[PDB]
Amino acid sequence: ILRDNIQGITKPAIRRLARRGGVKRISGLIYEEVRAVLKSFLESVIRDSVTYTEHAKRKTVTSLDVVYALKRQGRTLYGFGG
Amino acid sequence: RDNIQGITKPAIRRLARRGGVKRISGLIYEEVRAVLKSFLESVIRDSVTYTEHAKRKTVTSLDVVYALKRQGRTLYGFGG
Amino acid sequence: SKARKETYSSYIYKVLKQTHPDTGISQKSMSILNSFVNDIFERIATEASKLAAYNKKSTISAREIQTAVRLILPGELAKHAVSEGTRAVTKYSSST
Amino acid sequence: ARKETYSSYIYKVLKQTHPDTGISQKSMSILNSFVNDIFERIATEASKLAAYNKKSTISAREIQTAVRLILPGELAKHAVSEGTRAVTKYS
Amino acid sequence: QSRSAKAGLTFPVGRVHRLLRRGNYAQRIGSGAPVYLTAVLEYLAAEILELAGNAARDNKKTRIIPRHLQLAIRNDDELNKLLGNVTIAQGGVLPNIHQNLLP
Amino acid sequence: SRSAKAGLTFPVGRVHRLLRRGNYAQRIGSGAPVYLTAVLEYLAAEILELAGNAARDNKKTRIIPRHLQLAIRNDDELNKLLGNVTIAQGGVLPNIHQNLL
Amino acid sequence: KPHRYKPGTVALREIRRFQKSTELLIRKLPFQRLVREIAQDFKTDLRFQSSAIGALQESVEAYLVSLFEDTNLAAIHAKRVTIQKKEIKLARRLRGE
Amino acid sequence: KPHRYKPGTVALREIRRFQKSTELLIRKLPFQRLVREIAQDFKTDLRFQSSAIGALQESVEAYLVSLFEDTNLAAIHAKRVTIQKKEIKLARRLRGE
Secondary structure, three states: OOOOOHHHOOHHHHHHHHHOOOOOOOOOOHHHHHHHHHHHHHHHHHHHHHHHHHHOOOOOOOHHHHHHHHHOOOOOOOOOOO | OOHHHHOOHHHHHHHHHHOOOOEEOHHHHHHHHHHHHHHHHHHHHHHHHHHHHOOOOEEOHHHHHHHHHHOOOOOOOOOO | OOOOOOOOHHHHHHHHHHHOOOOOOOHHHHHHHHHHHHHHHHHHHHHHHHHHHHOOOOOOOHHHHHHHHHHHOOHHHHHHHHHHHHHHHHHHHHHO | OOOOOOHHHHHHHHHHHOOOOOOOHHHHHHHHHHHHHHHHHHHHHHHHHHHHOOOOEEOHHHHHHHHHHHOOHHHHHHHHHHHHHHHHHHO | OOOOOOOOOOOOHHHHHHHHHOOOOOOOOOOHHHHHHHHHHHHHHHHHHHHHHHHHHOOOOOOOOHHHHHHHHHOOHHHHHHOOOOOOOOOOOOOOOOOOOOO | OHHHHOOOOOOHHHHHHHHHHOOOOOEEOOHHHHHHHHHHHHHHHHHHHHHHHHHHHOOOOOOOHHHHHHHHHHOHHHHHHOOOOOOOOOOOOOOOOHHHO | OOOOOOOOOHHHHHHHHHHHOOOOOOOHHHHHHHHHHHHHHHOOOOOOOOOOOHHHHHHHHHHHHHHHHHHHHHHHHOOOOOOOHHHHHHHHHHOOO | OOOOOOOOHHHHHHHHHHHHOOOOOOOHHHHHHHHHHHHHOOOOOOEEOOOOOHHHHHHHHHHHHHHHHHHHHHHHHOOOOEEOHHHHHHHHHOOOO
């Protein structure tokens, strides 16, 4: 729950995700590098989310909070709380 | 007439040299010319739209700046 | 704990009925449509406001909105939307 | 005519920071674009967070939080400290 | 009676007028701008709803699955060209395959 | 001027009027323009000091566009803030790869 | 002889299935453990609701699927079909990330 | 003994010279009447001022040079010294276009 859960996105999970990109073979070192990329993106989103949460005088983080966090990325298409 | 060909083959060769390519394919010159045409048409449709809105027959620097603003280019310097 | 809210479920209902009286409607599509409506609204309004500020005019009229729409939207969509906007503003002025 | 520009203001910024090297008009234009764009971005996103914060009146705290959420760590924190100090001085 | 009915709409136009007025846009708001916005809603929502029904009949479902939303987005060139990065709400994607993979 | 009494160099009054008339809020806190101007001089001073350091690196007493370009590219925080920003006469950094050598 | 399919044979009907079906493909509880473990560092003891978790996984899934499609396009551009580290880094760099 | 340099090194010296000098690579009048031609079809009887056109040429040159740099990075990705059409299309497409 709070210790070494980065393996939640597992190697078979990464292989299945790469199946959706249209690839036949996934190399061994692909899994951990895409894990690091996902970690970086998730950290970048959640930093903005938690900073907004602190600004809003709120203790809980809502879905619309991360919606605004991703809003300044610059696309903002459909989704919950759009 | 035929003014797009005014950009010469040695000019595109130097431009690709700026891109750090030792040997450049022959079709690459005309492909670069074609993507340049697409770039200019995408910019200039918006520029002409803004010119027509602006109640002005002359395309000003601010006109080009506003045309470039929407497409995400956001240039600096000229009309900044 | 609520009295009145501004949602577009009646709008999608009647538009689908006037378009095809054979299709159902859910609320998830209602929310997604509301999101896209809001985003396109701020896009059009901000573009028109900044364009009016560019033309040193402090009064925002239908011309600014129509020009902003014609320059943001794809050419065929832009032209059709501008024609519809011109007819709508003319009929609204006639009705007053 | 008299216009509102940061010519003398950025000039005295330089004279307060680096009174040894002059500035060209190209760098004046670049700095003017930077300062203007930063101004509008902070103003608009602070206003929109305030609208989300169901407040139609903006105070120094809103600008503080807005800068702390847009800018990177060191820049945001230094801006927070200096702006809070200046606001507490003035009011 | 709201003025939308005589103009072919349904809005209480004062609602949108207030939204623009409190939106910090301009000191003077054109009266025809909210009406044109309502017309834009009517027709853009018409075409998007017909896209949603298009993708719904693509699966013979009277209700929607967000797969219908994804099909409506990706089968329309202007929607895909406009914006496609932010999350699709349970709609999935369109995995495009190549002609060199499969034997 | 009340800009100087704030410890500020950018015009506090002019920036306050821009905030009030910039379609931002009906009631603009008078400390908000001071805060904004403070951020602006902080960023401007960072840019100027980095440009001066780059000019000293190139043995030049003037801030040429190449100096400012290299100054921004040498700062990771600046690159994060300004990554797609393109500056004339700055060209690109001397980036080479040993594969083509 | 056992009906051993050649590599790449089942993939046809498999992509026929999962292109139409629109369910999730990642274990939920490990993912919520991950989002917790990254949240406590930013803010401890967060009282997570039932929401604000599925949106994150859907967004990251869409982003990584787009990145994987771009990587496959780059691999085909590289006169090959398989994925590799260089394809991923090139796709990410050309995406502005 | 004619003095003919081996191919490739003069390319490097040209690259260095174009790196030091940041002048416009396309003559002004060619861009002028190209813009005039491309604006003829949109609206007739349009006169172009002295300005607003050097900005167009500098923006096009800068973004096209960035595209060339991305294309060359993808070419090194492809392990070759030549630019190719698939290189250019991968550079364009992966940039959100």
